[PDB]
Amino acid sequence: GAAFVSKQEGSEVVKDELADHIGFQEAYRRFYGPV
Amino acid sequence: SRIGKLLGFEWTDLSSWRRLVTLLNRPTDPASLAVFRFLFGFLMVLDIPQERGLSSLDRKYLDGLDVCRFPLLDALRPLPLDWMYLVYTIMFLGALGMMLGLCYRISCVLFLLPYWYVFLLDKTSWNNHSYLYGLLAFQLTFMDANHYWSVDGLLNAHRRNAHVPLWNYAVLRGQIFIVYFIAGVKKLDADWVEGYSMEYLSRHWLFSPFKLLLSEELTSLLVVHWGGLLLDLSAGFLLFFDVSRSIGLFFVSYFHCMNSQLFSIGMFSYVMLASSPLFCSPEWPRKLVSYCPRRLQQLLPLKAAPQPSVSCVYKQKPGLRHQLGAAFTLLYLLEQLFLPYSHFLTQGYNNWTNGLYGYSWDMMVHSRSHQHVKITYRDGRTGELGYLNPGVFTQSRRWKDHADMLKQYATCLSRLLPKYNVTEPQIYFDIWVSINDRFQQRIFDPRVDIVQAAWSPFQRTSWVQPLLMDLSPWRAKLQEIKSSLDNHTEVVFIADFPGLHLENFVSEDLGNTSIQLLQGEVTVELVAEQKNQTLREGEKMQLPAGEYHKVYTTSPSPSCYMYVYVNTTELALEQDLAYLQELKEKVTPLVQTFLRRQQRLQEIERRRNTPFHERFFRFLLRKLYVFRRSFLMTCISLRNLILGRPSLEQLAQEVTYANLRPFE
Ligand SMILES: CC(C)=CCC/C(C)=C/CC/C(C)=C/CC/C(C)=C/C[C@]12O[C@@]1(C)C(=O)c1ccccc1C2=O
Ligand SMILES: *[C@@H]1O[C@H](CO)[C@@H](O[C@@H]2O[C@H](CO)[C@@H](O)[C@H](O)[C@H]2NC(C)=O)[C@H](O)[C@H]1NC(C)=O
Ligand SMILES: CC(C)CCC[C@@H](C)[C@H]1CC[C@H]2[C@@H]3CC=C4C[C@@H](O)CC[C@]4(C)[C@H]3CC[C@]12C
Ligand SMILES: *[C@@H]1O[C@H](CO)[C@@H](O)[C@H](O)[C@H]1NC(C)=O
Ligand SMILES: *[C@@H]1O[C@H](CO)[C@@H](O)[C@H](O)[C@H]1NC(C)=O
């Protein structure tokens, strides 16, 4: 889904975050509340 | 004697081992050691929520997170988030007691052990101050720094105002000399001497007096590069002697007042400022207490002469505690002179720059720019060659420079993938880096499976491409081609090795792209038209937009070429934006990108004329939210350990409370 890319965006040569991870907002609400 | 008042000792003091322990355990005043003990322990209290990441552990070490971690030892796995707040609580109560001097031997080990736990748990958080704060916490654990201005003085009578040995200063002076002087040897590179590393730094407003006398190109060569080489080579030499300390304390306090505002290095410019008076005479905080008013001196520490202590050798043969102190001086300061040059031993950590970043004092000597990162997995069951995201499960971007972190990333991706229906991936990294304005080239070989590739810490990496140092005189021409282009045309300089090729996908956005061959011989393949074209030196070839092309390097020498491209849809946006920019003043997704840019330009304008009393009032509320969230989210999980975990609807009630901006 979000862990992969196509061969039109991955082959483009010219073309404090820490929370734009893959399973972040699902694991955040698991080991915290519905914040 | 001429030497004895100059070096502090005579040559006869180095004539034996009993005379050397007597010299290095000389009774020395405790006062300069104890002000640095306060200033280091107070700057570590302010560093634990800010840079150590106590404000952001819930985003970093969250439970149930698929993440590729980079520890130095592969067996170092972090604790749960409920217990990693206790590691940062013990490290806080370690730095709190090391600040006050309350149970100072326990409070040093309660800081030293969970600092080097979280330091070695992530190789991408290593830099030259995070290394140094663990060195200074390692030194001060053995130093009798609570012998003045402490709570141990108020509890123990033999720790109140007592002498410290001379090796407590000669290791701390020997450390700050090595931080200064070895950095001046690492800045003898051809990139720092000729002025390529930190070339954009002179355009800052702090170098404006130097531009009143020199040009912008001569401010960069002399003041930033050679005035940072002649200062680093001669900082610990000037602070040491008596004839040049008052001159030398000015040049190194100006050096760190600038680096506090130029770079975001945390407390590095304040730790190197609090450690420069260690080179002063050790009675300097007694000379400032006596210069204070009389009713102020009752709150200050003692001004009386220090009592005799056990840790010193008085004019008496030395015991064991004195012999272990002079041995710690000669073995540690020789070990500190060896690790920045120990890169011939750890040759697996050797890349384009020698060794792993953090312990060599090569600060700002190499700067990078990554043009293209492409991760290609390969499903072992089907053969379906797919393409991963550039930075998938990492929390940093330092793995693309180092071969050890690429093996940790390729190994971690080999286990994580099976959750995403890729059973056994074969992972190829195609990473294009240019170091110090050089040509962009592949640092790692893009044909080898990095999962099964052989990285060993003591043998040289076979899949790291050699940095083409024979194309380093080309960089004077690369600034000529970059200057020859207008505001619309951008260029990308690329050197590719013999036998390799670059598969590139020009977007539909980039109309009128061209490739020109600077050196060598490349054959550019159009994939859709299935037609090759051999380029000569200087020959330009127009490339199709919205299609594929491959540039096969067929020369025996590493070939140099460049991508002269222009974003035509960026033009067609801005020539149509400038059409109604003038049409508006004479009196539908296009109007949405228009209106968000004008309120952006009034935001950049309003940020420039805000008063200085509001930038500092917003700086504290930015900072006091970091200290409030790091404290309140600690007690959220410290309740989870003592009183157990509550219900999840209650855990929401505290985390939304802890995430509140206090006065915003
Ligand atoms: C005309 C001449 C000829 C000299 C004039 C005066 C003068 C003196 C200029 C120095 C100006 C400054 C400001 C240079 C900053 C550039 C730089 C070289 C940064 C790297 C740094 O990153 C650090 C800033 C840092 O804190 C540090 C600490 C300990 C050792 C080394 C360092 C570093 O090297
Ligand atoms: C255009 O030329 C390049 C190189 O001259 C060709 O690339 C070769 O392709 C074959 C088969 O795919 C490989 O075995 C070779 O190793 C490639 N050469 C290099 C240097 O890697 C390419 O096939 C040519 N394209 C056309 C359409 O003729
Ligand atoms: C793993 C947990 C329990 C923490 C254990 C602490 C250990 C691993 C830490 C604490 C003190 C650390 C040492 C402190 C100082 C130095 C000098 C430096 O030039 C090389 C690393 C070295 C030698 C460190 C090695 C690692 C070390 C021994
Ligand atoms: C493409 O860009 C170059 C850059 O100078 C320019 O000379 C050339 O005329 C352009 N070609 C077209 C068709 O716009
Ligand atoms: C060209 O400009 C457009 C602006 O709308 C931008 O979205 C696009 O990413 C640019 N293309 C490249 C290759 O940078």
Contact B163, B306 (CB under 8 A): yes
Q: How far is CA B620 from CA B34, B55, B615, B630, in A?
A: 28, 15, 9, 15
How far off is chain A from B303, nearest CA to CA, in Å? 46
Task: Quickly list DSSP for B495-527.
Answer: EE-TT-EEEEE--SS--SEEEEEEES-EEEEET
Start and end residues for every CATH 2.60.120.10 domain found in chain B? 475-570
Ligand 3, atom 28: closest residue by C-alpha: B116
N-terminal to C-terminal alpha carbon distance within chain A: 24
Q: Give yes or no for A5 touching B (CB within 8 A).
A: yes
Edge to edge, the sheet with strand B548-553 lists B501-505, B548-553, B522-526, B531-534
Query: CB under 8 Å to B371, separation ≥6 — which residues?
Result: A13, A14, B432, B433, B434, B440, B492, B494
- Element (H or E) spanning B548, and its range? strand B548-553
Which ligand is closest to the CA of B512, given by its number?
Answer: 4
Return the axis-axis angle of helices B104-120 and B81-100, rounded to nearest 10°.
Answer: 140
Chain A residues with CB under 8 Å of B63 CB are 27, 30-31
Whole-number Å distance between alpha carbons of B248 and B232:
11
Residues in chain A: 35
- Using a 6 Å cutoff on CB, does residue B226 contact ligand 1? yes
SS3 B174: helix
DSSP strands (E only) in A1-35: 4-5
SS3 B600: helix
- Using a 6 Å cutoff on CB, does residue B346 contact ligand 4? no
Phi/psi for B53 (5° steps) reads 95, 30
Q: Which atom of ligand 4 is nearest to the CA of B486?
A: 5
The verdict on whether B187 is a catalytic residue reads yes
Contact B274, B32 (CB under 8 A): no
Nearest to B306 by CA among B34, B28, B38, B100: B28
Whole-number Å distance between alpha carbons of B255 and B239:
13
Task: Dig out the tokens for B196 from the structure.
Answer: 């390529």
Contact B389 A23 (CB under 8 A): no
Is B475-570 assigned to CATH 2.60.120.10?
yes
Please tell me which of the candidates B388, B393, B653 has its beta carbon nearest to residue A4: B388
- Using a 6 Å cutoff on CB, does residue B510 contact ligand 4? no
**Binding site per annotation, positions of A for Ca(2+):** 16
Nearest to B313 by CA among B173, B170, B172, B164: B164
